[PDB]
Design a binder for this molecule. Structure first.
Ligand SMILES: CCCCCCCCCCCCc1cn(-c2nc(N)c3ncn([C@@H]4O[C@H](COS(=O)(=O)NC(=O)c5ccccc5O)[C@@H](O)[C@H]4O)c3n2)nn1
Ligand SMILES: [Ca+2]
Ligand SMILES: [Ca+2]
Ligand SMILES: [Ca+2]
Length: 433
């Protein structure tokens, strides 16, 4: 009965975002539904030797949704998911969105401490993990949850033991009985993003706001049905999921090509095999690729666009991208809390190499402010403050911290130090608390 609580946009802002066509009041499953209508047999996911079409992705996620609904998991309920970079991540994500279960996707790199904190905050009735993960290699962590009355009703495991419920079995074989289910409402919470590094804080995201960020990013990045995007960063990460990420590529009718991580030789062979034309990396991974790229020129020719985001990316490195990787560069400065900035595909070389671009939306509002929260003279460095159609209004169940990072006009303070360039783009120069 009771939907997950979160901080709403003011009704004036909500109406404005609908009037502009940003919020279209559709669940995130729209991406899959529409793809199935238009091109059911196009490839949606390539993973190792597997090829999942749009209709297959739809069927398999429907399968799992029916099994969860059959067991009473639905609206008002939450789930914790921790899976590596495999097709099952998306099958599960779309299953939970279909079922109306609010999901927190932990990074596969998260350990006992973070997972415990996550469980304490959302009290999940469903836990999906992998027996190959250190935390679920034995039963010590799972058993500990009984002790604190935080045991989930259902545990599913990839690489399951004979005693476990098998994730693949719940995906493959449909429910015995029919129980009705549907997504949470479009202006209500779909899932929790996580802040970028104490433990990550939980960011409620609605269908409206996330779907908008996805659709608009897909247009900015020129995605189309021929896009084949390498997913070498962690699948659950905002950048890899939505900027424009796997969801963006599915929105545009393209195909996601999985890699376990950004190790260059493996990535290069995957790029060659599947003729990958887009990838998204952090600067430390770009350095790894640049070191090997000259020798494996042939394998990576098909790359047409590389996004780089997440961390400091100096000009000297940026210029090497088209030179050595033989593809266009796009810089991306985003946050899991909302605001994403992209250099545009028709930006000048100078903009592309020396800036972190400009916001998705004409209605991303930005203030750049000094120590007294006054707006700085044009071009000067200040603290970034932002609000918009896909920027959150508060962390989950955190009124004290929210009062510290939002001003009275509900602008969010990310801590980033930035300056507006004369060309209109942003340059990230630092961080302050
Ligand atoms: C020598 C002197 C020492 C050097 C000191 C240098 C100081 C640093 C200066 C610097 C930072 N730069 C910088 N550049 C970027 N292009 C950039 N993108 C993100 N950040 C930081 O990640 C947070 C959000 O994290 S997140 O996990 O939630 N989300 C993403 O990362 C994300 C990314 C893309 C799309 C969607 C996404 O969600 C943001 O708030 C920024 O702090 C970034 N920081 N560039 N220069
Ligand atoms: Ca297939
Ligand atoms: Ca190329
Ligand atoms: Ca070259």
């Amino acid at each position: 009965k009771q939907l997950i609580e979160f901080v709403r946009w003011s009704p004036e802002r909500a109406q404005h975002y609908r009037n502009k066509g940003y919020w279209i009041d559709q669940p995130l499953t729209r991406i899959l539904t529409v793809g199935v209508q238009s091109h059911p047999h196009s490839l949606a996911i390539i993973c190792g030797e597997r090829q999942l079409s749009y209709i297959e992705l739809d069927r398999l996620s429907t399968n799992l949704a029916t099994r969860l609904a059959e067991k009473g998991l639905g609206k008002g309920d939450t789930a914790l998911v921790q899976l590596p970079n495999v097709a099952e991540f998306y099958i599960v994500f779309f299953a939970l969105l279909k079922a109306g279960v609010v999901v927190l996707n932990a990074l596969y790199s998260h350990r006992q401490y973070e997972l415990n904190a996550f469980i304490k905050q959302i009290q999940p009735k469903l836990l999906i993990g992998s027996r190959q993960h250190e935390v679920f290699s034995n039963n010590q962590f799972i058993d500990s949850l009984h002790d604190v009355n935080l045991s989930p009703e259902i545990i599913l495991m990839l690489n399951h033991q004979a005693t476990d419920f098998g994730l693949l079995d719940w995906i493959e074989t449909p429910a015995e009985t029919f129980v009705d289910f549907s997504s949470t409402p479009a202006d209500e919470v779909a899932f929790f993003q996580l802040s970028g590094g104490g433990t990550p804080k939980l960011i409620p995201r609605t269908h409206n706001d996330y779907d908008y960020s996805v659709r608009a990013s897909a247009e900015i990045c020129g995605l189309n049905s021929n896009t084949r995007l390498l997913c070498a960063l962690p699948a659950p990460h905002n950048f890899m999921l939505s900027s424009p990420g796997a969801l963006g590529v599915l929105h545009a009718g393209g195909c996601v090509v999985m890699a376990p991580n950004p190790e260059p030789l493996n990535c290069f062979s995957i790029i060659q095999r599947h003729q990958v034309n887009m990838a998204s990396l952090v600067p430390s991974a770009v350095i790894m690729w640049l070191e090997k790229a000259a020798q494996y020129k042939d394998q990576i020719q098909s790359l047409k666009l590389l996004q780089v985001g997440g961390a400091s990316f100096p000009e000297s490195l940026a210029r090497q991208v088209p030179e050595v990787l033989n593809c266009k560069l796009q810089q991306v400065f985003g946050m899991a809390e909302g605001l994403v900035n992209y250099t545009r595909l028709d930006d000048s070389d100078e903009q592309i190499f020396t800036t972190q671009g400009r916001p998705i939306s004409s209605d991303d509002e930005i203030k750049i402010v000094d120590e007294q929260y006054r707006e700085v003279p044009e071009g000067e460095i200040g603290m970034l403050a932002t609000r918009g159609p896909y920027t959150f209004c508060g962390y989950y169940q955190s009124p004290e911290h929210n009062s510290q990072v939002f001003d009275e006009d509900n602008y969010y303070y990310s801590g980033d130090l930035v300056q507006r360039t004369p060309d209109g783009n942003l340059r990230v120069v630092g961080r302050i608390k």
